Amino acid sequence: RGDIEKVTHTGQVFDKEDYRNARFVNAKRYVNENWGIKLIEEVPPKECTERVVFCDGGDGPLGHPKVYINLDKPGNHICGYCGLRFVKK
Protein backbone atom coordinates (compact mmCIF):
# COMPACT_ATOMS: atom_id res chain seq x y z
CA ARG A 1 0.00 0.00 0.00
CA GLY A 2 1.12 3.52 -0.78
CA ASP A 3 0.07 4.84 2.63
CA ILE A 4 3.08 3.12 4.15
CA GLU A 5 5.40 4.31 1.43
CA LYS A 6 4.91 8.07 1.24
CA VAL A 7 7.63 10.43 2.42
CA THR A 8 6.32 12.72 5.12
CA HIS A 9 7.38 16.29 4.42
CA THR A 10 9.29 16.06 7.69
CA GLY A 11 11.21 13.38 5.80
CA GLN A 12 10.35 9.95 7.19
CA VAL A 13 9.71 6.60 5.59
CA PHE A 14 9.98 3.43 7.60
CA ASP A 15 12.86 1.40 6.23
CA LYS A 16 11.78 -1.47 4.01
CA GLU A 17 12.88 -4.01 6.65
CA ASP A 18 11.90 -2.09 9.80
CA TYR A 19 9.54 -3.70 12.29
CA ARG A 20 7.80 -0.39 12.98
CA ASN A 21 6.22 -0.85 9.56
CA ALA A 22 4.09 -3.54 11.18
CA ARG A 23 1.78 -1.07 12.91
CA PHE A 24 0.19 -0.18 9.55
CA VAL A 25 -0.70 -3.70 8.43
CA ASN A 26 -4.26 -2.80 9.43
CA ALA A 27 -4.33 1.01 9.71
CA LYS A 28 -3.51 3.81 7.32
CA ARG A 29 -0.36 5.90 7.58
CA TYR A 30 -1.83 9.38 7.27
CA VAL A 31 0.41 11.76 5.34
CA ASN A 32 -0.73 15.27 4.52
CA GLU A 33 -1.12 16.32 0.89
CA ASN A 34 -0.34 20.03 1.32
CA TRP A 35 3.35 20.69 1.93
CA GLY A 36 3.90 24.23 3.11
CA ILE A 37 7.26 24.40 1.34
CA LYS A 38 5.63 23.87 -2.05
CA LEU A 39 2.73 26.22 -1.37
CA ILE A 40 4.75 29.20 -0.19
CA GLU A 41 7.02 28.61 -3.17
CA GLU A 42 4.05 29.06 -5.48
CA VAL A 43 2.98 32.32 -3.86
CA PRO A 44 4.72 35.10 -5.82
CA PRO A 45 7.01 37.62 -4.09
CA LYS A 46 5.17 40.86 -3.45
CA GLU A 47 7.04 44.07 -4.22
CA CYS A 48 6.92 47.60 -2.83
CA THR A 49 8.64 50.97 -3.05
CA GLU A 50 9.60 51.87 0.50
CA ARG A 51 12.88 50.74 2.00
CA VAL A 52 10.95 49.13 4.86
CA VAL A 53 7.64 47.27 4.60
CA PHE A 54 5.49 45.63 7.23
CA CYS A 55 3.74 42.26 7.28
CA ASP A 56 1.22 40.72 9.60
CA GLY A 57 0.76 37.71 7.31
CA GLY A 58 -2.91 37.28 8.04
CA ASP A 59 -5.23 40.21 8.68
CA GLY A 60 -5.75 42.40 11.71
CA PRO A 61 -5.54 40.38 14.91
CA LEU A 62 -6.11 37.21 12.86
CA GLY A 63 -2.48 37.06 11.72
CA HIS A 64 0.95 37.09 13.25
CA PRO A 65 2.36 40.09 15.13
CA LYS A 66 3.23 43.03 12.93
CA VAL A 67 6.82 42.82 11.70
CA TYR A 68 8.88 45.32 9.71
CA ILE A 69 11.16 43.99 6.98
CA ASN A 70 13.81 46.09 5.25
CA LEU A 71 14.32 45.53 1.53
CA ASP A 72 17.48 47.48 0.74
CA LYS A 73 19.35 44.25 -0.01
CA PRO A 74 19.15 43.12 -3.65
CA GLY A 75 17.48 39.79 -2.99
CA ASN A 76 14.17 38.64 -1.57
CA HIS A 77 13.21 39.01 2.08
CA ILE A 78 11.10 36.31 3.71
CA CYS A 79 8.68 37.20 6.48
CA GLY A 80 9.87 35.44 9.59
CA TYR A 81 6.40 34.37 10.64
CA CYS A 82 4.25 33.71 7.59
CA GLY A 83 6.95 33.09 5.01
CA LEU A 84 5.61 35.75 2.67
CA ARG A 85 8.29 37.12 0.39
CA PHE A 86 9.20 40.71 -0.43
CA VAL A 87 11.37 42.29 -3.11
CA LYS A 88 12.09 46.00 -3.67
CA LYS A 89 13.12 46.57 -7.28
Partner: protein, 377 residues
Protein backbone atom coordinates in the same frame (compact mmCIF):
# COMPACT_ATOMS: atom_id res chain seq x y z
CA UNK B 1 30.40 -15.08 16.84
CA UNK B 2 26.63 -14.83 16.61
CA UNK B 3 25.67 -12.38 13.84
CA UNK B 4 23.16 -9.57 14.19
CA UNK B 5 19.99 -9.16 12.15
CA UNK B 6 19.20 -5.43 12.26
CA UNK B 7 21.38 -2.35 12.70
CA UNK B 8 18.63 0.23 13.25
CA UNK B 9 18.94 1.53 16.84
CA UNK B 10 15.18 2.07 16.93
CA UNK B 11 14.75 -1.63 16.12
CA UNK B 12 17.39 -2.57 18.70
CA UNK B 13 17.08 -3.66 22.31
CA UNK B 14 16.85 -0.91 24.90
CA UNK B 15 15.34 0.02 28.23
CA UNK B 16 15.47 -1.10 31.83
CA UNK B 17 13.16 -4.10 31.58
CA UNK B 18 9.41 -3.78 32.08
CA UNK B 19 6.30 -2.85 30.14
CA UNK B 20 8.18 -0.20 28.13
CA UNK B 21 11.69 -1.49 27.50
CA UNK B 22 11.61 -2.99 24.02
CA UNK B 23 13.41 -6.34 24.18
CA UNK B 24 14.40 -6.54 20.53
CA UNK B 25 11.84 -9.32 20.05
CA UNK B 26 8.87 -9.08 17.71
CA UNK B 27 6.67 -12.14 18.01
CA UNK B 28 3.51 -13.57 16.55
CA UNK B 29 1.78 -16.06 18.85
CA UNK B 30 -0.51 -18.33 16.86
CA UNK B 31 -3.31 -19.58 19.06
CA UNK B 32 -2.92 -16.82 21.62
CA UNK B 33 -6.48 -17.20 22.95
CA UNK B 34 -5.72 -20.49 24.65
CA UNK B 35 -4.80 -22.11 27.94
CA UNK B 36 -1.11 -21.34 27.42
CA UNK B 37 -1.35 -18.31 25.14
CA UNK B 38 -2.38 -16.12 28.06
CA UNK B 39 0.62 -17.19 30.08
CA UNK B 40 3.03 -16.74 27.19
CA UNK B 41 1.73 -13.34 26.16
CA UNK B 42 1.66 -11.96 29.70
CA UNK B 43 5.27 -13.04 30.10
CA UNK B 44 6.19 -11.46 26.78
CA UNK B 45 4.46 -8.22 27.70
CA UNK B 46 6.23 -8.17 31.06
CA UNK B 47 9.46 -8.20 29.09
CA UNK B 48 8.19 -5.32 26.99
CA UNK B 49 7.84 -7.26 23.76
CA UNK B 50 6.00 -6.48 20.54
CA UNK B 51 3.23 -8.99 19.74
CA UNK B 52 1.04 -9.55 16.68
CA UNK B 53 -1.54 -11.98 18.17
CA UNK B 54 -3.20 -13.53 15.12
CA UNK B 55 -6.74 -14.67 15.83
CA UNK B 56 -9.63 -16.39 14.06
CA UNK B 57 -12.37 -15.95 16.66
CA UNK B 58 -14.19 -12.73 17.35
CA UNK B 59 -11.73 -10.09 18.47
CA UNK B 60 -13.76 -9.79 21.68
CA UNK B 61 -12.33 -13.19 22.57
CA UNK B 62 -8.86 -11.63 22.52
CA UNK B 63 -9.49 -8.04 23.68
CA UNK B 64 -8.41 -9.12 27.15
CA UNK B 65 -4.86 -9.64 25.90
CA UNK B 66 -4.61 -5.90 25.19
CA UNK B 67 -4.09 -5.51 28.94
CA UNK B 68 -0.80 -7.42 28.71
CA UNK B 69 1.31 -4.69 27.08
CA UNK B 70 1.83 -0.96 26.93
CA UNK B 71 0.51 1.09 24.05
CA UNK B 72 1.25 -0.25 20.59
CA UNK B 73 2.90 -3.34 22.03
CA UNK B 74 -0.06 -5.49 20.96
CA UNK B 75 -1.80 -5.68 17.59
CA UNK B 76 -4.62 -8.08 16.68
CA UNK B 77 -4.47 -9.51 13.16
CA UNK B 78 -7.49 -11.38 11.86
CA UNK B 79 -6.49 -14.34 9.72
CA UNK B 80 -7.53 -17.89 9.02
CA UNK B 81 -5.44 -21.04 8.97
CA UNK B 82 -6.81 -21.71 5.48
CA UNK B 83 -5.51 -18.37 4.10
CA UNK B 84 -1.75 -18.53 3.48
CA UNK B 85 -1.85 -14.94 2.25
CA UNK B 86 -2.99 -13.68 5.64
CA UNK B 87 -0.32 -15.68 7.45
CA UNK B 88 2.37 -14.27 5.16
CA UNK B 89 1.18 -10.78 5.99
CA UNK B 90 1.15 -11.54 9.71
CA UNK B 91 4.77 -12.74 9.71
CA UNK B 92 6.58 -10.42 7.27
CA UNK B 93 7.89 -7.97 9.86
CA UNK B 94 8.05 -10.55 12.63
CA UNK B 95 11.21 -11.69 14.40
CA UNK B 96 9.85 -14.82 16.09
CA UNK B 97 6.78 -17.02 15.77
CA UNK B 98 5.26 -19.42 18.29
CA UNK B 99 2.85 -22.15 17.23
CA UNK B 100 0.35 -22.69 20.05
CA UNK B 101 -2.23 -23.95 17.59
CA UNK B 102 -4.07 -27.21 18.21
CA UNK B 103 -7.26 -28.59 19.71
CA UNK B 104 -7.70 -31.64 21.90
CA UNK B 105 -10.73 -33.02 20.04
CA UNK B 106 -11.79 -33.13 16.39
CA UNK B 107 -13.98 -30.59 14.64
CA UNK B 108 -16.25 -30.52 11.60
CA UNK B 109 -14.01 -28.00 9.83
CA UNK B 110 -10.74 -29.69 10.86
CA UNK B 111 -9.52 -33.24 11.18
CA UNK B 112 -6.49 -33.76 13.40
CA UNK B 113 -4.28 -33.95 10.32
CA UNK B 114 -5.31 -30.71 8.62
CA UNK B 115 -5.20 -28.60 11.79
CA UNK B 116 -2.36 -30.25 13.68
CA UNK B 117 0.26 -31.07 11.02
CA UNK B 118 -0.80 -29.77 7.61
CA UNK B 119 -1.51 -26.31 8.99
CA UNK B 120 1.69 -26.27 11.02
CA UNK B 121 3.95 -26.92 8.04
CA UNK B 122 2.18 -24.25 6.01
CA UNK B 123 2.88 -21.82 8.84
CA UNK B 124 6.52 -22.89 8.98
CA UNK B 125 7.00 -22.66 5.21
CA UNK B 126 5.48 -19.18 5.20
CA UNK B 127 7.58 -18.26 8.23
CA UNK B 128 10.74 -19.56 6.57
CA UNK B 129 10.04 -17.63 3.37
CA UNK B 130 9.45 -14.53 5.49
CA UNK B 131 12.89 -15.12 6.97
CA UNK B 132 11.97 -15.45 10.64
CA UNK B 133 14.90 -16.07 12.95
CA UNK B 134 13.21 -18.27 15.57
CA UNK B 135 10.36 -20.78 15.40
CA UNK B 136 8.86 -22.69 18.33
CA UNK B 137 6.51 -25.67 18.46
CA UNK B 138 4.80 -27.72 21.16
CA UNK B 139 4.43 -31.51 21.11
CA UNK B 140 3.05 -33.73 23.88
CA UNK B 141 5.67 -35.61 25.87
CA UNK B 142 4.19 -39.03 25.11
CA UNK B 143 4.89 -38.68 21.38
CA UNK B 144 5.44 -42.05 19.66
CA UNK B 145 6.22 -42.84 16.04
CA UNK B 146 3.81 -45.80 16.20
CA UNK B 147 1.07 -45.07 18.74
CA UNK B 148 -0.85 -48.03 20.12
CA UNK B 149 -4.15 -47.47 21.88
CA UNK B 150 -4.58 -48.81 25.40
CA UNK B 151 -8.32 -48.91 26.11
CA UNK B 152 -10.31 -47.50 23.17
CA UNK B 153 -9.39 -48.21 19.56
CA UNK B 154 -9.87 -44.88 17.81
CA UNK B 155 -8.17 -42.77 20.44
CA UNK B 156 -4.53 -42.36 19.41
CA UNK B 157 -4.92 -40.00 16.45
CA UNK B 158 -3.72 -37.07 18.54
CA UNK B 159 -0.45 -38.87 19.19
CA UNK B 160 -0.01 -39.78 15.52
CA UNK B 161 -0.70 -36.20 14.48
CA UNK B 162 1.75 -34.90 17.05
CA UNK B 163 4.57 -37.01 15.63
CA UNK B 164 3.67 -35.92 12.11
CA UNK B 165 3.67 -32.28 13.16
CA UNK B 166 7.14 -32.50 14.69
CA UNK B 167 8.85 -34.22 11.78
CA UNK B 168 7.38 -32.07 9.02
CA UNK B 169 7.92 -28.85 10.95
CA UNK B 170 11.56 -29.86 11.37
CA UNK B 171 11.52 -30.72 7.67
CA UNK B 172 10.24 -27.31 6.56
CA UNK B 173 12.26 -25.33 9.14
CA UNK B 174 15.97 -26.05 9.69
CA UNK B 175 16.28 -25.28 13.42
CA UNK B 176 13.02 -24.76 15.26
CA UNK B 177 12.70 -25.39 18.98
CA UNK B 178 10.15 -28.10 19.67
CA UNK B 179 9.40 -27.97 23.37
CA UNK B 180 7.51 -31.02 24.65
CA UNK B 181 5.22 -30.88 27.70
CA UNK B 182 2.46 -33.24 28.77
CA UNK B 183 -0.67 -32.59 30.85
CA UNK B 184 0.02 -28.98 31.79
CA UNK B 185 -1.81 -28.11 35.00
CA UNK B 186 -2.89 -24.55 35.67
CA UNK B 187 -5.90 -22.28 35.94
CA UNK B 188 -8.50 -22.91 33.24
CA UNK B 189 -6.67 -26.05 32.18
CA UNK B 190 -7.61 -29.33 30.55
CA UNK B 191 -5.93 -31.26 33.37
CA UNK B 192 -7.58 -30.06 36.58
CA UNK B 193 -10.92 -28.99 35.10
CA UNK B 194 -11.17 -32.47 33.62
CA UNK B 195 -10.56 -34.27 36.91
CA UNK B 196 -12.94 -31.81 38.61
CA UNK B 197 -15.85 -31.56 36.20
CA UNK B 198 -19.01 -33.49 36.95
CA UNK B 199 -19.48 -35.58 33.80
CA UNK B 200 -15.99 -36.96 34.36
CA UNK B 201 -17.25 -38.25 37.69
CA UNK B 202 -19.70 -41.10 37.85
CA UNK B 203 -22.15 -40.92 40.76
CA UNK B 204 -19.33 -40.61 43.31
CA UNK B 205 -16.90 -43.03 41.71
CA UNK B 206 -14.14 -41.72 39.49
CA UNK B 207 -13.34 -44.44 36.93
CA UNK B 208 -9.61 -44.78 36.29
CA UNK B 209 -7.77 -47.12 33.95
CA UNK B 210 -6.40 -49.97 36.07
CA UNK B 211 -7.78 -48.05 39.03
CA UNK B 212 -5.30 -45.36 38.07
CA UNK B 213 -2.69 -47.52 39.82
CA UNK B 214 -0.77 -48.53 36.68
CA UNK B 215 -0.03 -45.02 35.43
CA UNK B 216 2.87 -42.63 35.99
CA UNK B 217 2.22 -38.95 35.40
CA UNK B 218 4.61 -36.01 35.73
CA UNK B 219 2.60 -32.83 35.13
CA UNK B 220 4.22 -29.41 35.02
CA UNK B 221 2.84 -26.00 35.88
CA UNK B 222 1.71 -23.80 33.01
CA UNK B 223 3.66 -20.65 33.86
CA UNK B 224 6.89 -22.61 34.20
CA UNK B 225 6.19 -23.90 30.69
CA UNK B 226 5.55 -20.36 29.49
CA UNK B 227 8.60 -18.97 31.28
CA UNK B 228 10.57 -21.68 29.51
CA UNK B 229 9.15 -20.61 26.14
CA UNK B 230 10.29 -17.01 26.53
CA UNK B 231 13.69 -17.93 27.93
CA UNK B 232 14.26 -20.23 24.97
CA UNK B 233 12.92 -17.54 22.65
CA UNK B 234 15.35 -14.93 23.96
CA UNK B 235 18.19 -17.40 23.53
CA UNK B 236 18.90 -18.42 19.91
CA UNK B 237 21.49 -20.99 21.03
CA UNK B 238 18.58 -23.21 22.05
CA UNK B 239 17.65 -23.35 18.37
CA UNK B 240 17.12 -26.84 16.98
CA UNK B 241 16.76 -28.58 20.34
CA UNK B 242 13.84 -30.56 21.70
CA UNK B 243 13.05 -30.09 25.38
CA UNK B 244 11.15 -32.58 27.51
CA UNK B 245 9.20 -30.26 29.81
CA UNK B 246 8.39 -32.14 33.03
CA UNK B 247 7.82 -31.25 36.65
CA UNK B 248 9.99 -32.04 39.64
CA UNK B 249 8.47 -35.23 41.07
CA UNK B 250 6.66 -37.94 39.13
CA UNK B 251 3.43 -39.23 40.61
CA UNK B 252 0.87 -42.01 40.48
CA UNK B 253 -2.57 -40.97 39.26
CA UNK B 254 -4.13 -42.58 42.33
CA UNK B 255 -1.91 -40.45 44.56
CA UNK B 256 -2.94 -37.32 42.68
CA UNK B 257 -6.68 -37.89 42.59
CA UNK B 258 -6.84 -38.84 46.25
CA UNK B 259 -4.84 -35.73 47.08
CA UNK B 260 -7.09 -33.70 44.80
CA UNK B 261 -10.18 -34.94 46.60
CA UNK B 262 -8.50 -34.27 49.92
CA UNK B 263 -7.81 -30.71 48.78
CA UNK B 264 -11.40 -30.31 47.57
CA UNK B 265 -12.70 -31.65 50.91
CA UNK B 266 -14.33 -34.37 48.83
CA UNK B 267 -13.42 -36.96 51.50
CA UNK B 268 -14.71 -36.24 54.99
CA UNK B 269 -17.74 -38.48 55.65
CA UNK B 270 -20.56 -38.35 53.16
CA UNK B 271 -19.39 -37.30 49.72
CA UNK B 272 -17.85 -40.75 49.66
CA UNK B 273 -15.13 -40.97 47.04
CA UNK B 274 -14.52 -44.35 45.41
CA UNK B 275 -12.19 -45.40 42.60
CA UNK B 276 -13.43 -47.94 40.06
CA UNK B 277 -11.71 -49.63 37.16
CA UNK B 278 -12.71 -47.91 33.93
CA UNK B 279 -12.63 -51.32 32.24
CA UNK B 280 -15.14 -52.77 34.73
CA UNK B 281 -17.72 -50.08 34.05
CA UNK B 282 -18.75 -49.86 30.36
CA UNK B 283 -20.73 -46.65 30.92
CA UNK B 284 -17.86 -44.15 30.95
CA UNK B 285 -17.07 -44.70 27.28
CA UNK B 286 -20.67 -44.06 26.24
CA UNK B 287 -20.64 -40.79 28.15
CA UNK B 288 -17.59 -39.78 26.14
CA UNK B 289 -19.06 -40.96 22.84
CA UNK B 290 -22.44 -39.31 23.39
CA UNK B 291 -20.93 -36.16 24.89
CA UNK B 292 -18.71 -35.84 21.83
CA UNK B 293 -21.54 -36.50 19.39
CA UNK B 294 -23.90 -33.94 20.94
CA UNK B 295 -21.93 -30.84 21.86
CA UNK B 296 -21.32 -28.44 18.95
CA UNK B 297 -18.49 -26.55 20.62
CA UNK B 298 -15.92 -28.13 22.86
CA UNK B 299 -17.53 -31.18 24.51
CA UNK B 300 -18.60 -30.64 28.09
CA UNK B 301 -15.64 -31.00 30.43
CA UNK B 302 -13.43 -32.23 27.60
CA UNK B 303 -14.96 -35.68 27.89
CA UNK B 304 -14.15 -36.70 24.29
CA UNK B 305 -12.37 -40.08 24.15
CA UNK B 306 -9.00 -38.58 23.20
CA UNK B 307 -8.76 -37.07 26.68
CA UNK B 308 -9.46 -40.50 28.14
CA UNK B 309 -6.61 -42.09 26.21
CA UNK B 310 -4.32 -39.28 27.35
CA UNK B 311 -4.84 -39.97 31.04
CA UNK B 312 -4.26 -43.66 30.35
CA UNK B 313 -0.96 -43.00 28.58
CA UNK B 314 2.10 -42.90 30.80
CA UNK B 315 4.71 -40.14 30.77
CA UNK B 316 7.94 -41.55 29.31
CA UNK B 317 10.84 -39.13 29.71
CA UNK B 318 14.24 -39.78 28.15
CA UNK B 319 17.77 -38.76 29.04
CA UNK B 320 19.90 -36.75 26.64
CA UNK B 321 16.79 -34.91 25.49
CA UNK B 322 17.32 -31.60 27.32
CA UNK B 323 14.96 -30.38 30.03
CA UNK B 324 13.71 -27.33 31.90
CA UNK B 325 16.83 -27.24 34.06
CA UNK B 326 18.77 -26.88 30.81
CA UNK B 327 16.43 -23.94 30.14
CA UNK B 328 17.19 -22.46 33.57
CA UNK B 329 13.59 -22.60 34.79
CA UNK B 330 12.74 -23.29 38.41
CA UNK B 331 9.67 -25.53 38.71
CA UNK B 332 7.00 -24.74 41.25
CA UNK B 333 5.78 -28.09 42.51
CA UNK B 334 2.20 -29.22 42.80
CA UNK B 335 2.63 -29.04 46.57
CA UNK B 336 3.06 -25.26 46.26
CA UNK B 337 0.61 -24.56 43.44
CA UNK B 338 -2.26 -27.05 43.33
CA UNK B 339 -3.84 -26.35 46.75
CA UNK B 340 -4.61 -22.74 45.91
CA UNK B 341 -5.31 -23.87 42.36
CA UNK B 342 -8.25 -26.09 43.34
CA UNK B 343 -9.42 -23.91 46.24
CA UNK B 344 -12.41 -22.69 44.19
CA UNK B 345 -13.76 -26.22 43.81
CA UNK B 346 -13.65 -27.12 47.52
CA UNK B 347 -17.12 -28.04 48.73
CA UNK B 348 -19.19 -30.50 50.77
CA UNK B 349 -19.27 -28.69 54.13
CA UNK B 350 -22.14 -30.78 55.44
CA UNK B 351 -24.23 -29.77 58.41
CA UNK B 352 -24.17 -33.39 59.55
CA UNK B 353 -20.41 -33.55 60.13
CA UNK B 354 -17.29 -31.69 61.28
CA UNK B 355 -15.22 -29.26 59.22
CA UNK B 356 -12.31 -26.88 59.60
CA UNK B 357 -10.34 -29.01 62.05
CA UNK B 358 -9.76 -31.61 59.33
CA UNK B 359 -6.01 -31.58 58.77
CA UNK B 360 -4.35 -29.95 55.82
CA UNK B 361 -4.47 -32.51 52.98
CA UNK B 362 -1.45 -34.72 53.53
CA UNK B 363 0.57 -34.50 50.31
CA UNK B 364 1.05 -37.39 47.89
CA UNK B 365 4.22 -39.46 47.53
CA UNK B 366 6.46 -39.66 44.47
CA UNK B 367 7.45 -42.83 42.60
CA UNK B 368 11.13 -43.75 42.31
CA UNK B 369 12.89 -45.64 39.52
CA UNK B 370 13.07 -49.04 41.20
CA UNK B 371 9.59 -48.50 42.63
CA UNK B 372 8.46 -47.91 39.07
CA UNK B 373 10.17 -51.16 38.10
CA UNK B 374 8.09 -52.82 40.80
CA UNK B 375 4.94 -51.23 39.37
CA UNK B 376 5.63 -52.52 35.86
CA UNK B 377 7.23 -55.68 37.30
Amino acid sequence: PRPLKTTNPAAMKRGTGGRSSFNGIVATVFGATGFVGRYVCNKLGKSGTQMILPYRGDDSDVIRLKVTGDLGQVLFHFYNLEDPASIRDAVKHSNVVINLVGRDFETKNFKFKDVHVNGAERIARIAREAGVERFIHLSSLNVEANPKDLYVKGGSEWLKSKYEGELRVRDAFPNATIIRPADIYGSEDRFLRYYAHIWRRQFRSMPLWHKGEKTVKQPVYVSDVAQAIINAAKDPDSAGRIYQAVGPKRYQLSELVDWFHRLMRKDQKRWGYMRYDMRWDPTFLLKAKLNSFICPGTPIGGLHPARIEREAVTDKVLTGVPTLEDLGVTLTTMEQQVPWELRPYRAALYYDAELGEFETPSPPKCIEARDELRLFA
